Amino acid sequence: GREFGHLTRMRHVITYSLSPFEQRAFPHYFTKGIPNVLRRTRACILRVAPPFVVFYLVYTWGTQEFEKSKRKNPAAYEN
């Protein structure tokens, strides 16, 4: 059914490729790689981060509140 020969019809798309042995495996890995990673992180962070910040706030609040709940109340023994 799905085989390379008959997958789709494409016309007038020329692709130029180079042999692996003629090209470097890691080209500009850091000079270009780190800026691209920073760009992707800049794009993603606004969407991704806020919910985990909300989670951190909820987690801290819950832990502190449970700790407070266990703590003694002076008023109970006032009499």
């Binding site: 016309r11 020329i14 180079l18």
Partner: protein
Amino acid sequence: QLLDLAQKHFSSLSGTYVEDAVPAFTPCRFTGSEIRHRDDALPLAHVAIAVEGPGWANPDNVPLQVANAIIGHYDSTYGGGTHMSSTLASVAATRKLCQSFQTFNICYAETGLLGAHFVC
């Protein structure tokens, strides 16, 4: 007679280069690469694959030519078909794999293209 005629007519032509501008021959690098122009409208697919080969003067040209003759050439019009000695030719005829397949040994002064062209 040819030498006398050449002296009469071809003598004027000179090998001096104006302002000592002499072209320099340049060795050419062979890069392993793939260029695919995908035009599915075209009826049949043409593929040419080659490896770097000897120059004109390299003594290895003869054995490579013998090897390419061993690989052979096939066209659908060929009468021999299945019984042809070339294994590729026999298989293509039996399975009708390719309309035409030929082996080429293209040689330039310092490099050459050695491989095959098959339409299938």
